[PDB]
Amino acid sequence: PQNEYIEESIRKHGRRFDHEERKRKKAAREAHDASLYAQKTRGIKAKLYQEKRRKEKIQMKKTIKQHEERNAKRMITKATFVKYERFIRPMALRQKKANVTHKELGVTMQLPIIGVKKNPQSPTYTQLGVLTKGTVIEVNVSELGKYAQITNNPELDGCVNALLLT
Amino acid sequence: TSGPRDNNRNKWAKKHLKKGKRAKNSNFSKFLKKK
Amino acid sequence: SRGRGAASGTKYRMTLGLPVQAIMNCADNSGAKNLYIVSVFGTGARLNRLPAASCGDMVLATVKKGKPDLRKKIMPAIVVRQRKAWRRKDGVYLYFEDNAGVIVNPKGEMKGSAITGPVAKECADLWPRIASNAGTVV
Amino acid sequence: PKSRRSKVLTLAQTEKKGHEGKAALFSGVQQSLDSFDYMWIFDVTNMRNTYLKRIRDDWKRIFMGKTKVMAKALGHTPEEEHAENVSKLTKLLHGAVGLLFTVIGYFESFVQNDFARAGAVAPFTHVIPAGPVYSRAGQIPLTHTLEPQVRQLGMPTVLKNGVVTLLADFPLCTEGQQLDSRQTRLLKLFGITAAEFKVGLLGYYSKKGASVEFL
Amino acid sequence: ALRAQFENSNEIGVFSNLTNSYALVALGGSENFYSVFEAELGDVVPVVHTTIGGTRIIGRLTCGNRKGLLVPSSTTDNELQHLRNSLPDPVKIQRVDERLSALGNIVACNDYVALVHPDIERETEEIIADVLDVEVFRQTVAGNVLTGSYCALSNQGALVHPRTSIQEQDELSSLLQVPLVAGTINRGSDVIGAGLVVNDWCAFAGLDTTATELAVCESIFKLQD
Amino acid sequence: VSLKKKSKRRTTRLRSRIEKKAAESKRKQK
RNA sequence: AUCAGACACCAGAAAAGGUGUUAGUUCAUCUAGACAGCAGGACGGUGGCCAUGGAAGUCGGAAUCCGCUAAGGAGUGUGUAA
RNA sequence: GGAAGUCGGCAAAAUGGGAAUCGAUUCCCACUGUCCCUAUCUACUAUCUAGCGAAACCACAGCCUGGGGAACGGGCCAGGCAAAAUCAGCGGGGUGGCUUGUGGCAGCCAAGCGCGACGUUGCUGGCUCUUCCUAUCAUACCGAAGCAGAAUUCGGUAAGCGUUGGACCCACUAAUAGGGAGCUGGGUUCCUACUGAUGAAG
RNA sequence: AAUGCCGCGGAGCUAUCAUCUGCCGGAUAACGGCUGAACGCCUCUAAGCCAGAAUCCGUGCCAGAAAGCGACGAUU
Question: Which long-range contacts (CB under 8 A, 24 or more apart) does A20-28 make?
Fold first, then answer.
């Protein structure tokens, strides 16, 4: 069949006989259907239904608002950055790039970590380069050297998101 | 494939029993019954 | 679709005497000599049961000895003869003295042209092409 | 939380004045009473807005607002009524009746035809031929391209080969029978001009004569 | 030239055999095949709903002409008696004690001349000449031994492989005294006998036969009139 | 019959643990 | 309550959903006729202007003005290649 | 049929042997109940009987479900239940109401009570085994989709019934869905239960 | 001749290595509808009703309470 064959069939033969009245009835009873769904369904499907009904309800309240005024093993367990190295620092946990967000500019730049100054939780981790929450790390700012503080936990979040000290 | 517990299979099995397919059993029973 | 592909008739249950790993004689003039059984079509889920085939069954075959260009394809094969005795539905027990089969495409027409040796009528009935190109059908 | 009917809303941005509109209509009625002359009593009928605009064109204004709203503003009692002997005029003041300033001959004679409305009686027994539909009931020297009308008609018709075809003839109207909504809607697609706009000039609230007759 | 399918198979030569005096159709499947054959030959020659050895490949198991019919060794007595009762008296039936049971694959026979598998037994050849009353010749078709399956014969025309050479084409025509054309049936299948059954006045081929192929068979068999 | 998937009756550790951690919740909000 | 409750700061899930019910709080019109329901009008400049095969309010880009009013939005949706 | 079994020709049959690589390994041929897939036959034991006749072990014993803060147990709580005496088998019994499907930083709103919800914008271990759950791979029936047909995608009820054979790989299959509650390999230097068999007795 | 070795070998046992057999009544779920309010319209739902899955419950099949029972026969 070529191109828009089904409306060629619709144009030539018409639509199904009961379509308009069936869809009118379905739209009319959809009001009861939604409430029946809300009161019967349980589990994830209920929970996603709850969250999407909250979103739509807040959304329709906002547009009716917008309508209104227009009318009016010794190993390190924390991510690290690269005898004294008695513990094991896995290269997997090791990181080299961090997302530093400028305060005034409000722009997040993914830049390499030049170095780490000190970890507030433990200065011993500073020698190992372990990046923790609140740790001070200096990174190159030529494309923007400046210091910054870690705004999250590298061990949990995985991505080193930090806020620039500027 | 639908099983024997199928309500459809029961329905057209009943349809077979409703027609002459069981009338060969009625006259069959009547033959010994009369003799 | 390969499973019962172009069968033109159902097959009755037959004694299985050619399981997998079997080595068996090529029966056509295509040039192949020996076949190795890799798998059989239409085997379900039976724990520990070795897949097996009978006369007229279609198998996956590898030409162990034969022409090189005939090889390097896992080609469908039709088991035409079987050494294990089987009960024909009319009651007689039959067994050919060697296990023979033919190299065939998935559709059901072989690459060969003439069959050397007897052909089981069960094989010749599920596969009209083999019956068409058979020399003696028993 | 409560089994109550939903109240849907749209983005029309055309809310009416309500009480303010009624007050404006009352003020306009008072102004029309204070107007110069011609003391008309005619506001609207089954005719369309185009007919009303055409009637208003031959005037320099037809306006009544909500019916009996102007009568309430005037007052049944003569003391509240601006005119004289309005106690009997208020009772006759019903339906669509209003004043104008520009006449009598045009109102009595000029009655343009218009599409009929439900509730009245058809002037004849209109019938529709079977087979393909006729737009002008055989008066067109009539395209059958009204394919969506096949679904939207409800008459015994089937859309065959892209053309709306009626299996059997159906009499749309019958003489001496009240017109129903279905018949009126079906006749709307055709040329059923079964209407005649009229006016009422029984009396005139003249400034000096003040004789609103009931003829 | 007509298009027919036994069950849902393009090979009608395997499941039926047609001559100038009778027709044979398989038994136990759908008689729509028997229905089609009766629609064109019911008023001309008898149509027998027969099996050979409890088998439906009667077309490739039995070879015959307008005069006589042959059955292999595996033919049961009941079926042979059934065939004799069905066929008219002026037609003779013969059992063959041949090692090559597939008579329809080893013998391609028209009313006057038959060409046979090269390695046929002498006693088989003698009884074929006695029953069929045709001149028998041992030769291969396109280097292929199955003459009955790889060649179709009629009184006025015949077909062979497209793989045959022109000199083989001329030699086969000269040895058969009938026009012969190199062609194919059922859209490129080189089993002409399995895909085509022809009498002297009508032809049946599989429904998957191309229009060009049907024109070729009609052209060689002169069936327009 | 219970006609439930989860038992309406509670274990003594579980009932005791509510007063253990409900009080701590008031401590935390304080 | 087609998986009710007897639970025990109902504290983990907990933020909330429901055309289930009963009470309230604050604003709305209403015998100048309330909501709804059926009958009808819901227009004419105008197919406003760019935008296009074809877009006439409703593929699509700013509004979105006016004669009439009791009201007809350069138009709420369906729909039409239009 | 011929190692398809197993980590693997362990063990038997070929009588063990032919060629390669470093006694070992591989390959081709050969053989075979390791296996498909178990069946049959013999002797002994186990069975019963005559005689003889122990020991370990022993607070007392002997059903399960939920609870008993724990350690849940057999004794306690609430239930299902519950009928003498026994025989032969086989060996079972000697720690959040957690958790799940939707990441981290900043800004803009702003239902509301300095926060502020949704949004919105910014960036880098395997061999066999009983049963249960649904969170369904297939089979049954439905809804939606450019769903013309065929084939198909997603979603709903649904656990009744299936979910393989070989070295992640390649086939079969309608599908090869996910989990809960006798044994061996490479890796570090009495009673009670279950199953059958008798058995006193209104 | 500790079943000396070999062939055949009834009976028995046995092999998806052989043959046979494996069925229909309700109630529902998803879902599709009828009438019909709530809410003078509408609506599969609220009261009721219909159709509807290999689902649940029965029929069928196995066991027979050894503390469930009935009929019949004889009765020293």
Answer: A20/D151
Nearest-angstrom CA–CA distance, D45 and E28: 84
List the single residue in A13, A20, A71 with the smallest CB-CB distance to D159: A13
Q: Specify the fold of D19-109.
A: Alpha-Beta Plaits (3.30.70)
Q: Rounded distance, CA C50 to CA C43, Å?
A: 9
Range A110-114, long-range pairs (CB < 8 A, 24+ positions): A111/A139, A111/A140, A111/A141, A111/A143, A112/A139, A112/A140, A113/A81, A113/A137, A113/A138, A113/A139, A113/A160, A114/A138, A114/A139, A114/A140, A114/A145
Structure tokens at E217: 């068979």
DSSP letter for D47, please. Answer: S
CATH match for D120-189 among 3.30.420.270, 1.10.1420.10, 3.90.105.20, 1.10.760.10: 3.90.105.20
Give the CA angle between residues E111, E112, E116 to the nearest 5°: 95
Q: What residues are paired with E197 via a beta bridge?
A: E204
Experimentally, how was this structure solved?
A: cryo-EM
**Count of CA atoms in the C-beta half-sphere (13 A) of C64:** 11
Instruction: Quote the tokens at residue A135.
Output: 């740790």
Per-window interface: C 92-131 vs E, CB < 8 A: 109, 113-114, 119, 121, 124-125, 128-129, 131
Q: Are E150 and E161 in contact (CB under 8 A)?
A: yes
> In terms of residue numbers, what domain contains E185?
1-225
CA distance E217 to E153: 11
In whole angstroms, what is the distance from residue C95 CA to residue D62 CA?
112
Q: How long is the CA C63 to C1' H128 vector, in angstroms?
A: 35
The DSSP bridge partners found for residue E136 are: E114
Interatomic CA distance for residues E161 and E81, integer angstroms: 37
**I chain positions with any atom within 7 Å of a protein CB:** 16-19, 22-25, 27-28, 30, 32-34, 38-39, 41-46, 52-57
Count of domains forming chain E = 1
Q: For C91, left (φ over 0), alpha (ψ -120 to 50), or beta? A: left
State the Cα–Cα distance between residues D188 and C1, nearest whole angstrom: 61
